[PDB]
Amino acid sequence: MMEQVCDVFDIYAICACCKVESKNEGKKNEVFNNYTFRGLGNKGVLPWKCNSLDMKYFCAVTTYVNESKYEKLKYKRCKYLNKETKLQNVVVMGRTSWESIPKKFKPLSNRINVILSRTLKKEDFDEDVYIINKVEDLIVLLGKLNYYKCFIIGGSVVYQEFLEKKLIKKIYFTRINSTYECDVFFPEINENEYQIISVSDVYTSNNTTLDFIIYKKTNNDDEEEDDFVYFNFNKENSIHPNDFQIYNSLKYKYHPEYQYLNIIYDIMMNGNKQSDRTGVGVLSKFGYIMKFDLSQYFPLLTTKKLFLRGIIEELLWFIRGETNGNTLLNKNVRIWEANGTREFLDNRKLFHREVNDLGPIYGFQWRHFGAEYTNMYDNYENKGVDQLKNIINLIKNDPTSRRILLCAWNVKDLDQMALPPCHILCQFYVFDGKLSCIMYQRSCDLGLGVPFNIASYSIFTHMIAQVCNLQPAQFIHVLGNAHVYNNHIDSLKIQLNRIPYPFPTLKLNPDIKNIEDFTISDFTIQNYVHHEKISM
Amino acid sequence: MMEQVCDVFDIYAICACCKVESKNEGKKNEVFNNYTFRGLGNKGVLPWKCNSLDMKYFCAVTTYVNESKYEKLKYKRCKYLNKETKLQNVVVMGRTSWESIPKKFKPLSNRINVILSRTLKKEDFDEDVYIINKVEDLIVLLGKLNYYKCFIIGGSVVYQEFLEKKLIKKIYFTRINSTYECDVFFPEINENEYQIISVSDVYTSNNTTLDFIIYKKTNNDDEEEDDFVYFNFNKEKNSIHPNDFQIYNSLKYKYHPEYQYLNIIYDIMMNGNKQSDRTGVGVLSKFGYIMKFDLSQYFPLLTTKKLFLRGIIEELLWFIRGETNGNTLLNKNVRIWEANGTREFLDNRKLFHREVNDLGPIYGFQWRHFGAEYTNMYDNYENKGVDQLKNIINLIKNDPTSRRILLCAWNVKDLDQMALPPCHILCQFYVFDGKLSCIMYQRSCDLGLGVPFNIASYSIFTHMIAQVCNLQPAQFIHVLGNAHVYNNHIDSLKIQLNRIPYPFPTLKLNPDIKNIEDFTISDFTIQNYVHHEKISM
């Protein structure tokens, strides 16, 4: 029998918040949360100058109506008020917000404007809008109007006013993933009182990434669907129902990190229980694909903390053609340490191999495929097939070749390697000045390996694109044996109930024109916002 | 404004049909159409003995009701008759069909049973059933009962007259893809009166494949729906007309696994990039697809055109023997490798010192001898190089949970010595619960011509490897790198995409063959292949 006001009059908040310039004390231990994005305004303007995409979203959300849904809404409203029963939306804003607009775009096209202003007078109005001087007076004005929905579009004070009074049903919130000077700030959203229910794809507009989330207020010929039921006539790990409460609560999960997370979910829900070489046990499945649009974001996972110095150094080490594990160890990159011990090599039957002499692994295959391996210190210059050089020449001079592959699975050399490669091969595709990369991965440790693997090959696709005068397009990651280790299950449960942030961007020094000239200083990850580190 | 009787009272048909024993004069080149599946009954019983899955579907469809939707139906029916004011479905059958049901299943459970008869009346039945002696009395009865939907469940005579009288809104039609003795038949459906709107996944049950299709009678407080619209705020190419894919796009549900292939073609046609390529023909192309075929349920031989497998089987056996001699295939009248072995082709690869049809260290050589020095096609390479094929077989048997069971043809060292570099780059195997899956990664994929054969090749191989390792085949998973449609294939493929698939065939292997090397051409049989007309691409 009971109903809320915001439910009856369909009152929503729509906003856009950036990150704010702070004082950098303890930035090595900087914590991020939803409040990280709170920057509304500066000098009576937006902290950013123009965002074409957030603008387009603003318009499309505040101007969209469905006239065939109105009859339901009008009935409820007139029945609530105890009254008898082109359509537009209402846009409520503060005075400062109304002032800071061009003359050409006032009043806001296809929308019913409402300005909350004490000082202003209705009679000396040049324009044709409505005016109120109280929050109480809005509900009055809505009762006397035919409107689809009512959007609170601005003013820090306005937002704050409506939020305290529980007059907002949903918050449409653009996260602008860049830092600007700010005068005014969106209030801290209470987690008990609102929850996120949907998250969009990640985009780039005007030199920043952004995404769109929706907070919802908490409370604590359409008969051919029978044919769909008939198709499901034949359908019906040890997982619990509430292990994935937050994960399953979301309606729309369009953020590209859900490609990784959904795969985890699928293995956890439907994986096959297996022993493996390690003796730890896994849940596994066979055959997935993920795709990341490198034109829009750098897909560094945000649901836990990832570090990249090590994987960049590894990549540079691959590109030099190195097999000497000591090079990495002397830079405190320990990714290959365990695979180079006396004991590990002996268990591989490599009894005559020096410690950290990893054998003819990735780097050797990329630069010297087919050369005879001796030891890690030998001179292999101009020996074997320099695959790396050949793919770069192919991309430059025969971009429509279907033969642009870099393969590390050298069958003849597998037993000489400290271990056989996981990243079997890379294929490249060029169209309209744009480079995409498929990497096939025979064995995928989803909890610990895959997050790094995505980052490495995404960085590498940038590197190859740049030195070939191309823009990066897609990194396409194909998983063969995809497995969650049992000792990662509880960490991943925690991770899957976290909501991703808009991704970072990768910056390469643009002076680097040849694949072999990159050094560690040439890589910058910007605007990395992430949840707390998890140890698997 | 005038309403149809079948629409008001929601009258449907539901049947299962098999194929029927016909003349042996033209079986080498048989013609197939929807009327291929027309076998209803034999000597008062089903032509096939039992089919658990068809019975389960029959049960599911004829018992399902949605109580929420009834209020609208009651209103609609009440309105038609000019009246103001657990739920079950009605099933209507012929007398003969009633008597074919065993006593313990009569009357049909959780359904209102109705029986058409002239020779028998209420007094002749002990059971809770309505008897009617004419079709019009069904309609009168439906006006009086509260029910969800009404399913005509056969009799050959009952189906025939109900279709003749235009009282069927949809036909739920099981295609049983095997042949049995029949004496009663489903009537030939008029293509002008009914069109297929949905095709299901393909299944195996009781030693036959089957699927389920739906013919439709032709015309001759929780709302986040707006949030979905918002997320779509940023949205929009190769001289494509709408009518090109009229049939393809008319279907509501395209769950038949053949649509994995057809949908990729569609996607390339609509959204592919125009590019030149090595051939000069040019292509539409896209990068990165995955298809999955369940080999436990069907053999995925494409049905929207005709394909023969003798060549590709001979090729696979040639691969397994480790051969590189093109003449061996030519002497079996298989010409798959003929163009790649001519003097002119070898010279154009700069293989001036290679004998005609000496293909160099291609697939077979890499499978049995990776890393060995290629000399010529007649050399004895025994115990040279890495016998990958034997290694994977040993790994599958002895270390099934290994994540290292890969066969790789892309030997970077040898590429230039190959008549041409391999397209099917590697196979990775996976073993769980006594069942074998295979991923194949294909770097370059000719959608019109190559891919249909490649699916078949690696599906066969998966079965061979499974058999010799005492496992059952599960999934063949096909990963496409550079996926292209050739420009000269476009019109042919537009034709193909407006054909509706048939239930897939099955592949049988000689169970005596226990070693990968012991297979011969006669150890393989394709059964129950129903296909559209061959298309010359």
Ligand SMILES: NC(=O)c1ccc[n+]([C@@H]2O[C@H](COP(=O)([O-])OP(=O)(O)OC[C@H]3O[C@@H](n4cnc5c(N)ncnc54)[C@H](OP(=O)(O)O)[C@@H]3O)[C@@H](O)[C@H]2O)c1
């Ligand atoms: N999504 C976004 O990022 C977004 C959207 C819009 C604007 N902005 C930015 O934010 C800044 C403006 O925000 P702001 O909060 O400082 O200005 P504002 O809220 O737009 O304007 C404040 C004025 O609104 C009136 N008002 C507020 N609460 C009221 C109440 N309860 N009753 C009656 N009147 C009330 C008063 O007008 P009187 O002076 O008439 O009393 C008050 O001085 C600008 O820099 C603008 O560019 C950002």
Ligand SMILES: NC(=O)c1ccc[n+]([C@@H]2O[C@H](COP(=O)([O-])OP(=O)(O)OC[C@H]3O[C@@H](n4cnc5c(N)ncnc54)[C@H](OP(=O)(O)O)[C@@H]3O)[C@@H](O)[C@H]2O)c1
């Ligand atoms: N594969 C399938 O989908 C399927 C489904 C159902 C049945 N079947 C098979 O089909 C066969 C039976 O088919 P059938 O054509 O021989 O018989 P049927 O159509 O079930 O029954 C015909 C009988 O029903 C009565 N009947 C039909 N129309 C009537 C009307 N307008 N008014 C009064 N009575 C009417 C007559 O009964 P009286 O003789 O009493 O007058 C007639 O002899 C069996 O082999 C059965 O196993 C197959």
Ligand SMILES: CCc1nc(N)nc(N)c1OCCCOc1ccc(-c2c(N)nc(N)nc2CC)cc1
């Ligand atoms: C777009 C920011 C914004 N974004 C979201 N998701 N929610 C909001 N409430 C919001 O705030 C609207 C407050 C209105 O503020 C503006 C800004 C830009 C403009 C302008 C401008 N300065 N110049 C041009 N040419 N066009 C326009 C669009 C007419 C006008 C009003």
Ligand SMILES: CCc1nc(N)nc(N)c1OCCCOc1ccc(-c2c(N)nc(N)nc2CC)cc1
């Ligand atoms: C199933 C074939 C069938 N399949 C489809 N798609 N449509 C039909 N109209 C149809 O025909 C039904 C008319 C024939 O009805 C029956 C009843 C019961 C049975 C039986 C049986 N003979 N034996 C057992 N054990 N169980 C059952 C089901 C408890 C078989 C056929």
Ligand SMILES: O=c1ccn([C@H]2C[C@H](O)[C@@H](COP(=O)(O)O)O2)c(=O)[nH]1
């Ligand atoms: O870059 C890498 C390297 C290794 N692994 C994982 C996959 C397996 O969990 C393990 C290697 O084991 P084998 O598949 O080789 O048994 O390391 C990755 O996920 N990514």
Ligand SMILES: O=c1ccn([C@H]2C[C@H](O)[C@@H](COP(=O)(O)O)O2)c(=O)[nH]1
């Ligand atoms: O099993 C095969 C063999 C070849 N091709 C096609 C793909 C390409 O169109 C062509 C090989 O040309 P390149 O990709 O090597 O350019 O042959 C296949 O689709 N499948």
